[PDB]
Amino acid sequence: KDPRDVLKRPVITERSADLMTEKKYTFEVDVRANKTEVKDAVESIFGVKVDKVNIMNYKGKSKRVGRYTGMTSRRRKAIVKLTADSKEIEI
Amino acid sequence: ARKCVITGKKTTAGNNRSHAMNASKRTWGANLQKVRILVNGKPKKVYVSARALKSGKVERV
Amino acid sequence: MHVKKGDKVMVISGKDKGKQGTILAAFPKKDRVLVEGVNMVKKHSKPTQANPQGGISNQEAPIHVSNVMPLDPKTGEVTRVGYKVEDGKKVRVAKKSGQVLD
Amino acid sequence: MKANEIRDLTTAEIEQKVKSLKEELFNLRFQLATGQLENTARIREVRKAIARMKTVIREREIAANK
RNA sequence: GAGCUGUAAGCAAGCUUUGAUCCGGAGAUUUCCGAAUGGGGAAACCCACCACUCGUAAUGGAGUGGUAUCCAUAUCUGAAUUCAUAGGAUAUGAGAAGGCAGACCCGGGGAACUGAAACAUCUAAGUACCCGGAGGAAGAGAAAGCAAAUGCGAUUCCCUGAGUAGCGGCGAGCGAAACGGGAUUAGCCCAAACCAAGAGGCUUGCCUCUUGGGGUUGUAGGACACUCUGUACGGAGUUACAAAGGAACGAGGUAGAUGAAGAGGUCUGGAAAGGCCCGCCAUAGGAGGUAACAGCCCUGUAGUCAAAACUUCGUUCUCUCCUGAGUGGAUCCUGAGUACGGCGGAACACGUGAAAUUCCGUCGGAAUCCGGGAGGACCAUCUCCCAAGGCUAAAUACUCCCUAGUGACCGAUAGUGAACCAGUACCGUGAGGGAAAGGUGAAAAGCACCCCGGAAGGGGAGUGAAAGAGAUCCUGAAACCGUGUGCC
RNA sequence: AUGAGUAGCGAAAGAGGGGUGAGAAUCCCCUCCACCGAAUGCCUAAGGUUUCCUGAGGAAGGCUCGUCCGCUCAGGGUUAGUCGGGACCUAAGCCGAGGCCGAAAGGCGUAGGCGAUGGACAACAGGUUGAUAUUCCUGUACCACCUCCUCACCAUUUGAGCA
RNA sequence: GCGAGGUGAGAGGUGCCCGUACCGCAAACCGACACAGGUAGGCGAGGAGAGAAUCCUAAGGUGAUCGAGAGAACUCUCGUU
Ligand SMILES: [K+]
Ligand SMILES: [K+]
Ligand SMILES: [K+]
Ligand SMILES: [Mg+2]
Ligand SMILES: [Mg+2]
Ligand SMILES: [Mg+2]
Ligand SMILES: [Mg+2]
Ligand SMILES: [Mg+2]
Ligand SMILES: [Mg+2]
Ligand SMILES: [Mg+2]
Ligand SMILES: [Mg+2]
Ligand SMILES: [Mg+2]
Ligand SMILES: [Mg+2]
Ligand SMILES: [Mg+2]
Ligand SMILES: [Mg+2]
Ligand SMILES: [Mg+2]
Ligand SMILES: [Mg+2]
């Protein structure tokens, strides 16, 4: 499979912005990707050196619009720590 | 099941009848007997009705 | 529809009966059209991000497509519409005179 | 890229274009997330281009096995 | 053939005459679960093995394909045991599995309430229900028939026979069939005698099995002998009668095309399709929509056309297949654990009865052409058929679904439970039960602006024909709740 | 509708001073007082499933009020080789290739599997956010496996080594 | 049995999936309720005390989602006669 199927989009939040000072980048990834796949994808795509990947699953949030109610999609969030002597990611 | 492999004789339902004609359900069994016969030309012992054995065409092994 | 954007049509029904005008926009899903100068409505617009003043706007409202007829190129009278093939291309013809509209 | 143009390439050439379009789509999804993408219409066009190319590749594979 | 990017407003960014959106035919893709089938599992999740590929020094990681069971075919091995066999391994399979249309069909099992004014025989009823097999139909079907005539000629279904004959604690009830009139029509193929070939038991000149020919019936037919005759000239056929295949053409289905005639004048009106006065078209005065009721405003309708592709039927051609008449009565063949019988049950309208006929379990058990069965116990005579093998279309049953339509059918407590995001909300551990809820306007023109208020909600002003049409927005009854007051 | 402005408002100590606000007995802060303290504390199941944190709101829900909330609207928040579970094991029980039995459907059962509530198993201290922490950060460890490498030793068909 | 390359040490490297928020003797779970009920297990301090009893407290938590008066009959829960 292609590396660019694994990473969906970056997470841009106060928490993720804070982590970008410690050289950690938060991504939303495919729900079936393991953290080894995430590690490989980031290196191939961005040409960096990944120290470790931490990963977590998020449930769908219950949501309501008028009478109709439904679930948001569940997500899989990977925090990618780069090595000290690595190039940073540019976005 | 208790069904003759050759002729197909099996249990069948019907009524028992009292003298006062009260009807109650019951079965008639085939008179099946364990005998060694050819099954696909391979002698197995299976249940066959005595009636199917009566002829003698059904040879025992 | 028997008319399309750009055609000059005469309004045959409504308050603006008898008025000629150009089709500014067609809405085939609703069978309504926008005719220049016909069926003017006074929209009460609030101030918005686009328009900061707001105000009461005069604005064309759609009319049902069956209330307009194209004009005959010859006479300039209303005509029903027909179709003929011309150079391997279907065109509308003015049923009254016979000449092509577009 | 209309289908006619796609069919004139070789299978190797087409799959490369798929990779190029995947690079384009990937960058577009990143721009959207950061609020830096103006032409949102580009995303759907690129997706359909990839689909178009995959369709042509798969068409050839099927003609080969037959 | 000019807009489009669904409901669904809105903002955004775009696409389109170099033909978009949209409509139809045929393809591609089609995550995971589900018969679910690599293994497991608390469905929609987890863990593997084998090849090939990506990536790492390597491990770890990733992608594609294969990997259930049973059955069939082929091959290789072959236990206790000697040959063998069981078993095991490999390959090959558009083989089976599961679902449903709550229907129709054929079977395996099979109630009770209830009726009998109690109740057991009986009824309800072979119904409900459970289960299996299926097919577009199913079952039945080409006389061991119906009958009692100068007879009929497969089966199925409709009318009638007839609520008759009958059955029945002769109670409650149950209840035919044949003849007659119709729909539809259609007939065939084997087993055996015999011939030829081949093989194994040599059972030893006999027999069995296997191929092809032959042959298919009843005042008998066939084999076998005799002649006559065809060997395709001619006949048939994939719906039985053997079984697949291909063309050409016709008519359809799945998108569409074209399609006559009034903005007629005038009167109200917010708006004419209405009123009044005039025309015109009609193989078109079906219908829907359009600012009030339209044959002549729009989509249409009558009529006449249209298909790249897929699909249905039909007719021809190709193709495939194919002998059938007469005379003999030497001998031979004409369906065996069968028909039938006793015992125990069941089905026949028919409850064991005088009980024929059909089916099942158990036991006994024929004739076989000088033969056999039936005609309601049974015998004799006569009449009619030839069982114990198979196939067979049409007329018939039913509708979840598709198309086109119809109604002295409903019109929001009605009609489907469900006109509305309904098998939803809610209730239940679960099977399961199961609602309420439609209407602004022709068009959002959905009330700019001002005043009181935190807002809600109001009062003006505007839009509109109408706001006493302002979002639970057509009409707005009664209960019920208030305000004012003429009399008490 | 009547009953009716009636019954009830679900065990319990609050008081005052500031703040916010259109509005405060009810929300926030301060002070004192009071209650639990083998719990009314801390942790962690089953279960719930976003109720958690931040900001905004006061229609409805909250037996009063409301500026407030486990409510409404927006955002955000869950980081593991070592913790618990699976790539480990099995009990009861369940399933079950062939198989046995049964009108049908099915029942039983061998091999073989599944199945914790048990067995086995490698990380600790401190720090840190509004919301996570043996998970992130700092320090110092440990377990299994792999070899582009280095060193040491052994042995190459009674031959080390693995098993 | 397998086996020509092996064993030990060091250096370097690899280590996947699921759960992780919050309540959990409670207003969040089971009781139709923000319900005097029910809910396994671990920790569970001081004085007096045998004690996890009892009374008052620590850590920590809490002041209970209608109030202000009045202080009749009667009712309930108590105290003394
Ligand atoms: K009109
Ligand atoms: K009504
Ligand atoms: K104590
Ligand atoms: Mg995790
Ligand atoms: Mg009775
Ligand atoms: Mg037309
Ligand atoms: Mg017309
Ligand atoms: Mg009107
Ligand atoms: Mg209704
Ligand atoms: Mg109206
Ligand atoms: Mg009272
Ligand atoms: Mg209280
Ligand atoms: Mg909170
Ligand atoms: Mg309140
Ligand atoms: Mg355990
Ligand atoms: Mg926690
Ligand atoms: Mg006293």
Side-chain angles (χ1 to χ4, degrees):
Chain A
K1 59 146 61 178
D2 187 75
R4 301 183 153 67
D5 305 323
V6 176
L7 273 54
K8 283 206 193 294
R9 67 182 59 85
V11 178
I12 305 300
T13 69
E14 75 301 357
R15 180 67 152 278
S16 64
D18 173 21
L19 295 193
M20 266 187 291
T21 74
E22 293 74 49
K23 212 177 179 183
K24 285 174 173 156
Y25 297 79
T26 308
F27 296 102
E28 277 182 358
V29 311
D30 177 297
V31 291
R32 287 166 292 124
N34 61 31
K35 55 169 65 169
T36 291
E37 267 177 315
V38 174
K39 177 188 192 176
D40 307 333
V42 168
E43 293 190 6
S44 297
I45 292 168
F46 296 109
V48 301
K49 295 303 312 309
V50 175
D51 180 9
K52 65 185 180 188
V53 179
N54 282 230
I55 204 164
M56 69 180 75
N57 298 320
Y58 264 86
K59 293 189 205 175
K61 283 193 179 177
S62 175
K63 184 156 302 310
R64 164 164 291 97
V65 168
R67 68 206 238 79
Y68 303 137
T69 181
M71 300 303 306
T72 305
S73 173
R74 59 192 164 81
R75 309 169 294 144
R76 183 166 182 76
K77 188 169 62 176
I79 305 175
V80 182
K81 179 183 179 182
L82 304 177
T83 66
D85 52 4
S86 175
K87 171 181 66 171
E88 85 309 341
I89 305 183
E90 314 76 342
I91 49 189
Chain B
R2 226 59 156 193
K3 164 267 291 176
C4 174
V5 303
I6 297 162
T7 59
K9 291 175 183 286
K10 43 167 182 63
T11 60
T12 307
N15 291 333
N16 174 83
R17 289 281 187 179
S18 65
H19 177 280
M21 293 300 300
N22 297 120
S24 64
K25 287 294 191 149
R26 63 152 286 179
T27 62
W28 274 256
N31 186 14
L32 294 174
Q33 300 299 340
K34 196 86 79 178
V35 294
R36 293 169 52 77
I37 74 186
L38 286 298
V39 174
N40 318 115
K42 310 312 309 281
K44 182 158 62 185
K45 40 184 68 189
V46 298
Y47 286 129
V48 182
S49 68
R51 184 68 164 193
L53 298 172
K54 183 208 222 289
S55 176
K57 65 193 178 296
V58 177
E59 78 303 23
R60 303 202 197 179
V61 169
Chain C
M1 292 183 305
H2 67 306
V3 297
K4 55 159 83 186
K5 172 178 179 173
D7 300 333
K8 289 202 65 179
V9 301
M10 184 137 140
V11 176
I12 57 173
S13 295
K15 289 186 174 74
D16 300 342
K17 173 179 186 168
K19 208 169 298 190
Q20 292 192 11
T22 305
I23 303 303
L24 303 173
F27 306 90
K29 289 155 156 192
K30 296 188 170 171
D31 300 1
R32 315 185 74 79
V33 297
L34 215 62
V35 184
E36 172 70 325
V38 177
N39 196 20
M40 301 304 303
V41 295
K42 279 147 281 175
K43 180 81 190 66
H44 297 50
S45 58
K46 279 203 70 63
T48 75
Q49 171 59 300
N51 174 17
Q53 51 271 54
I56 295 165
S57 312
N58 288 20
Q59 180 193 22
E60 289 74 343
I63 63 171
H64 197 264
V65 72
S66 68
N67 289 342
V68 307
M69 291 179 68
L71 305 175
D72 192 320
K74 277 287 304 314
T75 67
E77 306 176 348
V78 305
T79 177
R80 289 179 300 279
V81 168
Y83 302 80
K84 76 174 183 174
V85 183
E86 184 285 332
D87 198 344
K89 284 192 162 176
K90 184 182 292 151
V91 293
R92 295 181 299 163
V93 298
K95 184 59 188 195
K96 182 185 302 308
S97 61
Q99 304 189 350
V100 178
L101 284 308
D102 45 8
Chain D
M1 286 287 295
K2 306 314 303 302
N4 72 88
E5 291 79 353
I6 297 299
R7 290 190 178 82
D8 316 333
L9 307 180
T10 67
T11 61
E13 295 160 323
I14 299 172
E15 56 184 297
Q16 293 321 316
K17 287 293 305 306
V18 170
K19 295 294 304 312
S20 182
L21 295 177
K22 297 283 274 299
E23 300 264 352
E24 176 67 0
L25 207 179
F26 180 86
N27 296 339
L28 291 167
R29 287 198 313 251
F30 268 57
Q31 296 179 59
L32 197 173
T34 59
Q36 308 312 289
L37 180 52
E38 295 65 357
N39 182 20
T40 69
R42 182 58 181 167
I43 306 178
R44 173 178 285 95
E45 296 179 6
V46 173
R47 287 167 53 227
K48 291 169 43 52
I50 294 169
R52 201 164 298 110
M53 288 182 183
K54 293 217 180 204
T55 292
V56 167
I57 281 178
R58 175 55 173 178
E59 160 179 349
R60 286 186 185 175
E61 304 302 68
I62 291 297
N65 290 331
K66 173 182 178 180

